[PDB]
Every structure is written in structure tokens, then in C-alpha cells.
Subunit: 162 residues, 4 copies
């Protein structure tokens, strides 16, 4: 919980509206599908799928985005015999959470006021693509924020009677 939060505190982050996050899932999934060659026969245990995902993620860009080529190059870091399985399993896992992000519109619609202003909802994620896709695929939680602001004038000294 607070480990996830500290992970976010220790790196450059990015604000996503629910729509923008849904769109990112659509883009990543479509690129990965372009890499599909033959369908898998065997299917990685979740134990081995985790080890392969590690290699895949270490080969992804830490730039803020990834082109199909970047994704396909990262697929190569995956042991060859397991590549097909890894890839179809990755797509299935992403397509399953892809549907789930739509449920954030519920939470994100609840009005909130902070510092006397309506505070909009935004998912909070790593700016780094490798760190971000790792979070979306394997973490149990997704962070988010309610955003507001404090005017500096309201931070000035306003007497001993508060």
C-alpha cells in the first residue's frame, strides 16, 4: 500500500484521465497483437510467466512511450520457446484489465471538494513506460489522485486569531 505510494514518490509520474488510460490500453494491446505469429501450444505457469515478464520489462523503453518496434524488440528478450505463450498470455491479461478500467468512471465521477474547489480524479502512473506497464500488468492496485491547489495569498500570515 504505502510501498506502492513510495514507489510513485521516488520517480517521475504522470496524470491519466480514465479515457486516456483506456486509450493507452487500446494502443499497447493493438501493437502487441501485431506481433503475434503462431498461437501458443503450452502456456506459462504464473511462476514462469513472471520470470519472462521481468526480462520483457527490462527490455522495454524507460522513455514515456513505446512504438510497436520497441514492444516487438522487447518480446525477443523472452526465451524463444516461451515467446508465443508469453505474448498471448500478456495480451489476455491486458484485455481483462482493459475492461476493468471502465469501472474507474464510477469512482472518478464522485464529486469532491478540496480547498474549496472541485477536485478532479486522475490515475497516477510512472512516466517510464517499462515501470508503468509493469505496474498495470502485475500490481494489485492502481494509484490515483484528487487534484487541487492552494493560492499563495491564502498561505500568508492572517493574525493570531487565525
Amino acid at each position: 500500500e504505502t510501498d506502492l505510494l513510495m514507489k510513485m514518490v521516488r520517480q517521475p509520474v504522470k496524470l491519466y484521465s480514465v479515457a486516456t488510460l483506456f486509450h493507452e490500453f487500446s494502443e499497447v494491446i493493438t501493437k502487441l497483437e501485431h506481433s503475434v505469429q503462431k498461437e501458443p501450444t503450452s502456456l506459462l505457469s504464473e511462476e514462469n510467466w513472471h520470470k519472462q515478464f521481468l526480462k520483457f520489462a527490462q527490455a522495454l523503453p524507460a522513455h514515456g512511450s513505446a512504438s510497436w518496434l520497441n514492444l516487438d524488440d522487447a518480446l525477443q528478450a523472452v526465451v524463444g520457446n516461451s515467446r508465443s505463450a508469453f505474448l498471448h498470455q500478456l495480451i489476455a491479461k491486458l484485455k481483462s484489465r482493459h475492461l476493468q478500467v471502465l469501472e474507474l468512471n464510477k469512482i472518478g465521477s464522485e464529486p469532491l471538494d478540496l480547498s474549496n474547489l472541485p477536485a478532479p480524479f486522475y490515475v497516477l502512473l510512472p512516466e517510464s513506460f517499462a515501470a508503468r506497464i509493469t505496474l498495470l500488468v502485475q500490481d494489485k492496485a492502481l494509484p490515483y489522485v484528487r487534484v487541487s491547489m492552494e493560492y499563495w495569498h491564502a498561505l500568508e500570515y492572517k493574525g493570531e486569531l487565525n
Copy 2:
């Protein structure tokens, strides 16, 4: 307002506790005091001071931090005649807000639960040093966030009866 928040969603951002922001002000201010040579005689108008601050900020690093040398080099972009004035005026503006930063402990301490969890307070600022210092010195507002998280299990389909 919304203009300020869009500026934040369009770039890599960073989470600051009130303590780490106060510490950042302390670091930037002592570095700038190290660049002080002579005392200013006549000082800049908010018109000319802003023109000079723009040149100063354009010469600052867009990396996440700035060393003394980076700050002193940026000072050189300021017209030589207006430099000592610009510098003393900049230090005074920063020291004034430096005290106001302490007032954020009020707001920050106010309890809040989001998604059934304690939602900690964090100032939200640009990752880029040039962008961050511009906001802290020139803007009338300072953005912040209340942070929380949704577990993916809670985003799964829970049936037709809410």
C-alpha cells in the same frame, strides 16, 4: 486554475511532502546567496523583473535539479546591468514564499479518506527544475494532491445488484 492543472497533466510531475519542498527552498536559496557579489543599488520593476526572470529560467536545467554552477550560469543570461538587482530580488521573493510553505502543514494535516484509505497530502510540481522554479516563483497558486489507490479486484464485475 484549470489552466494550471492542464499544465501539470501535460508534463512529467513530481510529488513533494511539505518537508521536502521546504528543504528544496532552503537548497535553492543558499546556492543563489553564494552567487551574490555586490549589493544592488537600483532595483527592477515587476515589468523588467519578469522579462529578466524569463531569460533566467530559459537558461536553467530541465533536468530535475540544479547545482550551484547551473544556477550561476543561468544568472549570466540576465543583462549584466540588471543582474545583481535581479538576484537580490529573486532571493527576497523566494525567502518570502519559503515562510509561507510552512502554512501548508495545516491543510496537509487535515484527515481525508479516499476509497476507504487514508489519503496523504503532497504538493504536485513539474519534474523539470526550470518549470518548477518558474511555478514556485511566478504563479499565484501551488498544486497539490491527495493520494490513494483502487485495487483491481474492486474493479471486477460485481453483478447487477450494485
Copy 3:
């Protein structure tokens, strides 16, 4: 010359192969073309085109990439009466340099050896999309590097006879 270099030294940068830079031009140009509504009647002087480009660039993401929506939103910062002209002129300017990047394959093919290794050629650009597109569109030069490496063992002390 060295001003351009210092600008690169003061911010996070990115290495582009000639092919990857060509592909980036193709992506940006196609997105901007999707924003075209009606053809321009008047056409911005280069003086006014520069002022409008400034506004456009200030509204672009400082994240490492931009989606069509990000580009189209930035187009709105452009004075309305001049939007059409700005946009067609921006596309023409990009399409003209797009052809020119192909000439980098000449320079980039010249073999080079640094530290006893073949040193590959890479264009060097801002990680920030707004800073990058500003450079590609309006600077007179494009930076690049020849990359190599020094082994730490070769940096150890090797006697007084060198």
C-alpha cells in the same frame, strides 16, 4: 552552435537513428493532417508564424511523445483566425525537412572509430516533445553524436611510462 549544444547539455536527451527520426516525422505529420479542416486563404508571415508557433509549442506535452489529441489541443492555443494558416504552414515546413532527414544516411554511414571501436551515428534530441519539435521545426541545425565507450580497466593506473 555551442548554444545549441549547451541547450542539449541542460536537459534530458534522447538518441535517434535516422530511421527512427524519419518515422517520428511521418507520425507527427499524419496526426497534424488529421486536424486539417478547411484550407487556408491568407498565409502567416514568417514573423507572425513564429509568434503562433510559440503559443502552439507552449501548449504541447513536455512528456516524450504526443497523441493526435495532444497535437489538436495545442492547435487551439493558436489564434483562431490564423489556425488554418498556421497548421498548413506547419505541415509544409515539416514535410520539407522530412525529405532532408534522408540525407543524414550519408553522414551516418561514414565509418568512425573511437576508443578502438566502431562509433555509431545518432541524432541527439530533447526527450521533451515540445522542446524536440521546436528544435526540428525552427533551429538551423540538428545535433548528433558518435557513440562509444571506455572500459574501466583501461582507466586504471598503468605505470609511469604510460
Copy 4:
């Protein structure tokens, strides 16, 4: 070799003069010395030291720099029994390379012209602090660059006779 360079093209990078890199080593080392408490008794094997360094690096900021607190917090991720040893071993490894950094002044001083201009030497490292410190401490090589530029006018079509 090429593995190291691909790692560099897949993330935001930063240009360091030999002086600024030497200064970075000085800063990181004095901060780590501030975390020293007791003297280590028994020390880690390169096997166990690397296992501990991994945990240490994962807890470092991916922001471009690290404060003393960031470094000291990262030290806590190291098993408590191996911590004082890990820390003294880390300081010794850094001080050893700190001296080797000075040898880069040889290579760096060697003249070079690229595209008919003096091509300055710069060490090339990750923007992320965690990635940068990992490379400097663990890698057998250090990447560098010779920097230059091509004017767009020189990329225009110059005719069929070369």
C-alpha cells in the same frame, strides 16, 4: 557492448563533462559517508554484495538526483545484518572509480572534428539516478559521446554532381 548502447538508446540520457561526473562522485560519496554508523566486521562476497546492491538500487529515486535522505532510505532496503558492510564496500568501490574518472581527461582532450566542427567529448549516462549509479558501480564500461551538428541547409538537395 552493443547491449550497453541499446540500454542507453532505450531511456532518457544525460551528457556529463569529466568535471561534472567527478563532482557527482564527490557528492554521492560524501552523502553515503554521512550514513556511516559502525564499522563493518565481516564483509560481503561479490555474490551477496550484488544481491544487496540490487535491493539498494531498486529503492533509489528514478528522479535525476538523490538527496542524503533518499540514499539513506535506500540503505534500509538492504538486510540489516549486511548493511554496514554493504555501505563500506559501496563507498570503497565508488572511491576507487572516483580516481579512475580523472583518466578520462586523456581521451576527452584528444582533438576531433565531425562535420567540419570541433566535436566535444561527454560521458553519456542515464537520466535516472538509480540507473546511473547502477551503471557507474556495476558496469565494466562507461559510455561517451563526441558531439556535433548538421545544418539543415547542408541537407538540402545539392544536385546530381555530388
